[PDB]
Scaffold this active site. Structure first.
Site, mmCIF file in Angstrom:
data_model
loop_
_atom_site.group_PDB
_atom_site.id
_atom_site.type_symbol
_atom_site.label_atom_id
_atom_site.label_comp_id
_atom_site.label_asym_id
_atom_site.label_seq_id
_atom_site.Cartn_x
_atom_site.Cartn_y
_atom_site.Cartn_z
ATOM 1 N N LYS A 13 0.844 -1.213 0.000
ATOM 2 C CA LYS A 13 0.000 0.000 0.000
ATOM 3 C C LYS A 13 0.868 1.248 0.000
ATOM 4 O O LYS A 13 0.561 2.190 -0.800
ATOM 5 C CB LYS A 13 -0.865 0.031 1.272
ATOM 6 C CG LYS A 13 -1.991 -0.956 1.303
ATOM 7 C CD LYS A 13 -2.981 -0.669 2.435
ATOM 8 C CE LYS A 13 -2.357 -0.781 3.840
ATOM 9 N NZ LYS A 13 -2.529 -2.160 4.376
ATOM 10 N N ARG A 88 -10.292 -0.648 7.839
ATOM 11 C CA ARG A 88 -9.773 -2.041 7.858
ATOM 12 C C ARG A 88 -10.619 -2.976 8.665
ATOM 13 O O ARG A 88 -10.249 -4.128 8.955
ATOM 14 C CB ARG A 88 -8.278 -2.115 7.976
ATOM 15 C CG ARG A 88 -7.938 -1.962 9.407
ATOM 16 C CD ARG A 88 -6.460 -1.673 9.580
ATOM 17 N NE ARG A 88 -5.426 -2.573 9.042
ATOM 18 C CZ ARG A 88 -4.226 -2.202 8.541
ATOM 19 N NH1 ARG A 88 -3.816 -0.966 8.228
ATOM 20 N NH2 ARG A 88 -3.376 -3.185 8.375
ATOM 21 N N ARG A 127 12.307 -4.747 5.098
ATOM 22 C CA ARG A 127 11.938 -3.366 4.863
ATOM 23 C C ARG A 127 12.773 -2.335 5.689
ATOM 24 O O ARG A 127 12.999 -2.537 6.896
ATOM 25 C CB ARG A 127 10.418 -3.140 5.241
ATOM 26 C CG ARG A 127 10.015 -1.686 5.214
ATOM 27 C CD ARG A 127 8.487 -1.402 5.184
ATOM 28 N NE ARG A 127 7.826 -1.907 6.371
ATOM 29 C CZ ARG A 127 6.536 -1.661 6.579
ATOM 30 N NH1 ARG A 127 5.822 -1.003 5.656
ATOM 31 N NH2 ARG A 127 5.965 -1.993 7.703
ATOM 32 N N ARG A 160 10.863 -0.443 11.217
ATOM 33 C CA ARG A 160 9.650 -0.164 11.976
ATOM 34 C C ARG A 160 9.571 -1.121 13.146
ATOM 35 O O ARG A 160 9.874 -2.323 13.050
ATOM 36 C CB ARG A 160 8.391 -0.286 11.047
ATOM 37 C CG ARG A 160 7.568 1.003 11.094
ATOM 38 C CD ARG A 160 6.418 0.944 10.074
ATOM 39 N NE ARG A 160 5.373 0.045 10.403
ATOM 40 C CZ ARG A 160 4.375 -0.182 9.564
ATOM 41 N NH1 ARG A 160 4.281 0.565 8.428
ATOM 42 N NH2 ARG A 160 3.405 -1.040 9.885
ATOM 43 N N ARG A 171 0.182 -9.623 13.035
ATOM 44 C CA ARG A 171 -0.489 -8.652 12.121
ATOM 45 C C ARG A 171 -1.185 -9.410 10.990
ATOM 46 O O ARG A 171 -2.268 -9.046 10.557
ATOM 47 C CB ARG A 171 0.510 -7.613 11.580
ATOM 48 C CG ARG A 171 1.018 -6.659 12.690
ATOM 49 C CD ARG A 171 2.318 -6.022 12.304
ATOM 50 N NE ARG A 171 2.203 -5.330 10.976
ATOM 51 C CZ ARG A 171 3.247 -4.896 10.275
ATOM 52 N NH1 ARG A 171 4.496 -5.127 10.669
ATOM 53 N NH2 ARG A 171 2.993 -4.253 9.112
HETATM 54 N N1 AP5 Z 1 5.758 -5.165 -5.607
HETATM 55 C C1 AP5 Z 1 6.696 -5.342 -4.696
HETATM 56 N N2 AP5 Z 1 7.587 -6.356 -4.856
HETATM 57 C C2 AP5 Z 1 8.528 -6.529 -3.892
HETATM 58 N N3 AP5 Z 1 8.755 -5.821 -2.801
HETATM 59 C C3 AP5 Z 1 7.823 -4.813 -2.649
HETATM 60 C C4 AP5 Z 1 6.810 -4.520 -3.572
HETATM 61 N N4 AP5 Z 1 6.048 -3.420 -3.139
HETATM 62 C C5 AP5 Z 1 6.645 -3.043 -1.987
HETATM 63 N N5 AP5 Z 1 7.749 -3.849 -1.687
HETATM 64 C C6 AP5 Z 1 8.606 -3.782 -0.512
HETATM 65 O O1 AP5 Z 1 7.903 -4.530 0.492
HETATM 66 C C7 AP5 Z 1 7.926 -3.860 1.795
HETATM 67 C C8 AP5 Z 1 6.504 -3.488 2.167
HETATM 68 O O2 AP5 Z 1 6.071 -2.421 1.238
HETATM 69 P P1 AP5 Z 1 5.152 -1.245 1.764
HETATM 70 O O3 AP5 Z 1 4.674 -0.500 0.541
HETATM 71 O O4 AP5 Z 1 5.839 -0.471 2.828
HETATM 72 O O5 AP5 Z 1 3.982 -2.109 2.387
HETATM 73 P P2 AP5 Z 1 2.569 -1.756 3.043
HETATM 74 O O6 AP5 Z 1 1.555 -2.616 2.423
HETATM 75 O O7 AP5 Z 1 2.362 -0.270 3.067
HETATM 76 O O8 AP5 Z 1 2.760 -2.373 4.532
HETATM 77 P P3 AP5 Z 1 2.567 -1.801 6.000
HETATM 78 O O9 AP5 Z 1 3.325 -2.739 6.868
HETATM 79 O O10 AP5 Z 1 2.947 -0.356 6.068
HETATM 80 O O11 AP5 Z 1 0.993 -2.070 6.062
HETATM 81 P P4 AP5 Z 1 0.031 -2.310 7.309
HETATM 82 O O12 AP5 Z 1 -1.304 -2.170 6.890
HETATM 83 O O13 AP5 Z 1 0.432 -3.582 7.976
HETATM 84 O O14 AP5 Z 1 0.512 -1.125 8.318
HETATM 85 P P5 AP5 Z 1 -0.132 0.310 8.702
HETATM 86 O O15 AP5 Z 1 0.986 1.277 8.795
HETATM 87 O O16 AP5 Z 1 -1.260 0.661 7.819
HETATM 88 O O17 AP5 Z 1 -0.750 0.042 10.144
HETATM 89 C C9 AP5 Z 1 0.239 -0.231 11.214
HETATM 90 C C10 AP5 Z 1 -0.610 -0.493 12.457
HETATM 91 O O18 AP5 Z 1 -1.423 0.654 12.810
HETATM 92 C C11 AP5 Z 1 -2.633 0.179 13.348
HETATM 93 N N6 AP5 Z 1 -3.660 0.627 12.381
HETATM 94 C C12 AP5 Z 1 -3.452 1.179 11.145
HETATM 95 N N7 AP5 Z 1 -4.605 1.497 10.535
HETATM 96 C C13 AP5 Z 1 -5.598 1.114 11.382
HETATM 97 C C14 AP5 Z 1 -7.039 1.126 11.263
HETATM 98 N N8 AP5 Z 1 -7.691 1.555 10.198
HETATM 99 N N9 AP5 Z 1 -7.681 0.592 12.286
HETATM 100 C C15 AP5 Z 1 -7.040 0.134 13.380
HETATM 101 N N10 AP5 Z 1 -5.735 0.026 13.577
HETATM 102 C C16 AP5 Z 1 -5.007 0.532 12.561
HETATM 103 C C17 AP5 Z 1 -2.588 -1.334 13.456
HETATM 104 O O19 AP5 Z 1 -2.017 -1.696 14.745
HETATM 105 C C18 AP5 Z 1 -1.565 -1.677 12.342
HETATM 106 O O20 AP5 Z 1 -0.962 -2.949 12.570
HETATM 107 C C19 AP5 Z 1 8.885 -2.646 1.586
HETATM 108 O O21 AP5 Z 1 10.192 -3.118 1.951
HETATM 109 C C20 AP5 Z 1 8.847 -2.398 0.070
HETATM 110 O O22 AP5 Z 1 10.047 -1.863 -0.454
HETATM 111 MG MG MG Z 2 2.275 1.374 4.732
#
Ligand code: AP5
Ligand code: MG
Ligand code: ZN
Length: 217
Positions: A13, A88, A127, A160, A171
């Site tokens: 994402k 989510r 990452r 992170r 997660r």
């Molecule tokens: N095509 C490809 N091929 C190969 N490699 C690739 C690639 N594309 C990317 N990559 C590589 O792969 C890696 C990942 O890419 P990256 O693009 O960083 O991945 P991402 O999908 O953004 O992953 P996140 O870990 O940031 O998502 P998440 O939803 O778990 O966390 P969030 O911050 O929203 O949420 C964190 C926490 O906040 C809380 N939270 C967030 N939102 C909410 C909500 N709505 N409700 C409740 N709790 C919430 C929860 O506790 C949650 O766990 C990088 O190294 C990148 O270089």
């Molecule tokens: Mg992200």
């Protein structure tokens, strides 16, 4: 151009959001970034979300809906927005429907970036993130030009706090549980579009452009 990104942890994402913002000129709204910033400043919101985030659990719906409603009321969102990681849960999606009907800004698409869970641990364990601008790299799949430093600004890369293997495992299980209900909800609304996120980054983005370049005001 009112867009939501969904995906399992590490599906891409944030990497796709950065490209969507640059091509289409809408603001990025990431609940994860909002909570991690509040954690960093140790605000009451921060301290209260931290107990969930650290364990890899969802932060409760009520507080998360609130920060998103506040953010969406800012004037930049008049032209569109890219929500990343919210909703989510079904309850967050139902609240957002109501907010957006009141604001007159209904979702055009929810883009689900689909990736096999079995690929995601390796994405997250490799990452490395910029401490300055938040952009993400991967040691193998998308490295910085110089190790440890961001290409854009020279900022120190970090890991992170929740990307430790045992947190990633929780997660994945927490978010896989929400996946079916949330895809049914947005498919039944006829706004869900899936993309294969197990491609090269630029190939995933090419599919995102087919979807978003097909919208017309
Ligand atoms: N095509 C490809 N091929 C190969 N490699 C690739 C690639 N594309 C990317 N990559 C590589 O792969 C890696 C990942 O890419 P990256 O693009 O960083 O991945 P991402 O999908 O953004 O992953 P996140 O870990 O940031 O998502 P998440 O939803 O778990 O966390 P969030 O911050 O929203 O949420 C964190 C926490 O906040 C809380 N939270 C967030 N939102 C909410 C909500 N709505 N409700 C409740 N709790 C919430 C929860 O506790 C949650 O766990 C990088 O190294 C990148 O270089
Ligand atoms: Mg992200
Ligand atoms: Zn940077």
């Amino acid at each position: 151009m009112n867009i939501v990104l969904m995906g399992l942890p590490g599906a891409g994402k944030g990497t796709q959001a950065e490209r969507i913002v640059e091509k289409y000129g809408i603001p990025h709204i990431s609940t994860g970034d909002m909570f991690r910033a509040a954690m960093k400043e140790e605000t009451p919101l921060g301290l209260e979300a931290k107990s969930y985030i650290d364990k890899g659990e969802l932060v409760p719906d009520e507080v998360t809906i609130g920060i998103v409603r506040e953010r969406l009321s800012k004037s930049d969102c008049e032209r569109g927005f890219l929500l990343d990681g919210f909703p989510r849960t079904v309850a967050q999606a139902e609240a957002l429907e109501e907010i957006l009907e009141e604001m007159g800004r209904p979702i055009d698409y929810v883009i689900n970036i689909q990736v096999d869970k079995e690929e995601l641990m390796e994405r997250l364990t490799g990452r490395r993130i910029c401490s300055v601008c938040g952009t993400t790299y991967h040691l193998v799949f998308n490295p910085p030009k110089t190790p440890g430093i961001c290409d854009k600004d020279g900022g120190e890369l970090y890991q992170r706090a929740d990307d430790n293997e045992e947190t990633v495992t929780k997660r994945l299980e927490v978010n896989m549980k929400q996946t079916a209900p949330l895809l049914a909800f947005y498919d039944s609304k006829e706004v869900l579009v899936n993309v294969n996120g197990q491609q090269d980054i630029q190939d995933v983005f090419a599919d995102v452009k087919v979807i978003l370049g097909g919208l017309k005001q």
